[PDB]
């Protein structure tokens, strides 16, 4: 009931397919999502985004809370998962999940090792939404709905700087993206 998620192209977003992840701000709004990992830990992987305008990142791929419907509407629920082409580094999965609070920062960091399906508690921190970010383009949201007698955050994704890195964390101003279909690339 809720509306389509649309690429650059104007197309509907779908679900299971390749997405690239695009800052909707070039030049200094950097470029694309990836996995990445932190200099002191190997797994699981963290969600970065690339400095250079150039680099559209490691593509994405949603999947619906129910696997039924093919299209990803706002604010519904989902996951997502990065689609590594480069064998895994891990055995973690490389699916988005919220991390426990970083006390050091003030901030709830996105991150990996996130679980594909079953709604519900055991899952909570898996599941997202998409928003439009007001003019142009879309932000990410953490509020799930999976379980209804559960107390969540909830909160616009915006990025920050840390360690030289840029990673995803909550905040009150979520940073917009726009989507690439992978293969209408090269």
């Known amino acids: 009931k809720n509306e389509p998620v649309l690429d650059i192209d104007g197309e509907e977003l779908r679900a299971g397919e390749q997405y690239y992840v695009v800052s909707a701000i070039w030049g200094p709004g950097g470029g694309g999502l990836a996995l990445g990992r932190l200099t002191d830990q ?3 992987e963290i969600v970065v985004q690339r400095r250079s305008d150039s680099d559209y990142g490691t593509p994405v791929i949603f999947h619906n809370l129910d696997t039924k ?95 030289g890195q840029i990673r995803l964390a909550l905040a009150e101003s979520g940073w917009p993206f726009v989507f690439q279909k992978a293969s209408s690339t090269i």
């Open 42 to 44: 190997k797994c699981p």
């Open 69 to 163: 419907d093919d299209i990803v509407r706002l604010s519904t629920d989902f996951n997502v998962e990065f689609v590594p082409i480069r064998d895994r580094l891990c055995l973690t999965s490389t699916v988005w999940k919220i991390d426990d609070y970083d006390t050091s920062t003030g901030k709830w960091w996105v991150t990996t090792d996130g679980v594909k399906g079953n709604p519900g508690p055991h899952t909570l921190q898996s599941w997202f939404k998409i928003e439009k970010s007001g003019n142009f383009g879309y932000k990410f949201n953490f509020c799930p709905s999976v379980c209804e007698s559960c107390i969540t955050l909830c909160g616009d994704i915006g990025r920050y700087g840390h360690d």
